[model samples]
Target: KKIEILIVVDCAGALATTSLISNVYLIDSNQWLGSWDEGTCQLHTVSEDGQFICWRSCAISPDDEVNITGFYGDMIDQKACLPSPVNDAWEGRVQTRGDTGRYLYTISLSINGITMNFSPYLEVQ
Candidate 1:
């Protein structure tokens, strides 16, 4: 089994800027797992919330919904898990509350033989 990553990015309503680079790997036809493998991932942003998730391998439909194992967690610092789907796209907003300042966001993904790290920057409006 191999891993690949595909990244997704958004400008956050043009109020802020963010860049992402991802690689996705197709190991199983029933599931699209990335190089990071199935494990735990901690995703952090400039926001006040800290995102965390425990990833695992499961069944998925390729035609209707490609089973892409990714990371998802709480962005609002809540005690709930968010379904972070695999793909190269950021679905939510990365907002800032102060003057123009650079905020760094990091994502630490740990898997069996691989640890993927990603850092994204956010500029406040």
Candidate 2:
């Protein structure tokens, strides 16, 4: 079965304003993995109440399905025009066992839209 999970941002987590928010979610699954396809997996800071800020969708080499074991996806800001804003969007795909359980997903974004390679974690609930 599927569940509605609300991935919350870590307030105490020390994240670089020039990078994405890493370790955002905790999957309830055991055999799950996560990874980014293209562009930089960065995060931005929001003034108002929100989870993520922005991301850039630039020239991604292989816009294909990335093998993800956990929840490791990034956000985007279409209106972002600077090097740190979400000028574009990125894509990520996940594959795991079909079972009845909860899962956790974590991701890190950058503020400067500087793409960084990240291996997010996924846990079972």
Candidate 3:
């Protein structure tokens, strides 16, 4: 047997900028999961202590070198003069982010490689 389905999504909203500190944001994967057979969207759950990948883009210099620094878990990580002229990505485990807290995982690039930059954090959960 064969089954067919169609899904339609509507997003109506506005973009606003604000300057606030100590802001808490809850990000769940399920909000992006779309299934045809299910006919409905569900929250995606990350596996316990699973691997997660994070990526971003930055301007590229003539030497194709860049410096990246940010907080990973309870430690401060840095990558100096990395030859990442093309593709760059980082991987981490869920448990490292901590059990409960508004963890701010940031990645700053010195150069912008491509015309557009895509920053998305993916997790097994």
Candidate 4:
């Protein structure tokens, strides 16, 4: 049961004008991540509220959506996760806002000796 939702990843847009490089990474314990790599990722398109599950994975190219364990919450036992597809660096992070809540996904990344993540949306202003 796969559905089609349009999630775009890139290294340009207004986010590019800022200092956030979405395609960056560093190894911690053993996991993966990348900046949205096209630009700073800020979630805007939605119809619900509060249940924001960021669907970006740490991998070789965020656009690829392959590799690395994905991020949700504690619902999945995936810890010390995957690498951003591009392996870029930070001042970089992904920005997500809500249109829904309480969903579930099953995904994870294998280090193969690598790991990743965005700085994430820590301040919603």
lDDT of each: 0.30, 0.27, 0.26, 0.30
Per-residue lDDT tens digits for candidate 3, residues 39-107, read 222312233333433323222224343333333322223221111222343333354433332232233
Off by over 4 Å in 4: 1-20, 24-47, 50-65, 70-113, 119-125
Q: Which ranges of candidate 2 are over 4 A from the true structure?
A: 1-87, 113-125
- Model 1: runs farther than 4 Å from truth? 1-88, 109-113
Q: Provide the RMSD of all predictions against the true structure, rounded to 1 decimal.
A: 14.8, 15.3, 13.3, 12.9
Instruction: Say what the RMSD of model 3 is.
Output: 13.3
Candidate that would win on TM-score: 3
Task: Quote each prediction's TM-score.
Answer: 0.27, 0.22, 0.29, 0.25
lDDT of 4 by residue, 30-59 (tens): 133233455544322121222232333243
Candidate 1 local lDDT, 1-125, one digit each (tens): 12122332121211122212323222322243333223432222222222222222211222221222334233223322233544432233333333444444444433222344344333233
Global local distance difference test of model 1:
0.30
The residue-by-residue lDDT of candidate 2 on 1-125, one tens digit each, is 32212222332332344232352332222222232234643222212121122222222223222121122432212211111312233222222233322222233333123333343322221
Comparing 1 with 3 on TM-score, the higher-scoring candidate is: 3
Query: Lowest lDDT 10-mer window, candidate 3?
Result: 11-20
Lowest summed-lDDT stretch of 10 residues in model 2?
74-83
Which sequence of candidate numbers ranks them by TM-score, best first? 3, 1, 4, 2
For model 3, what is the error of residue 82's alpha carbon versus the real structure, in angstroms, after optimal superposition?
17
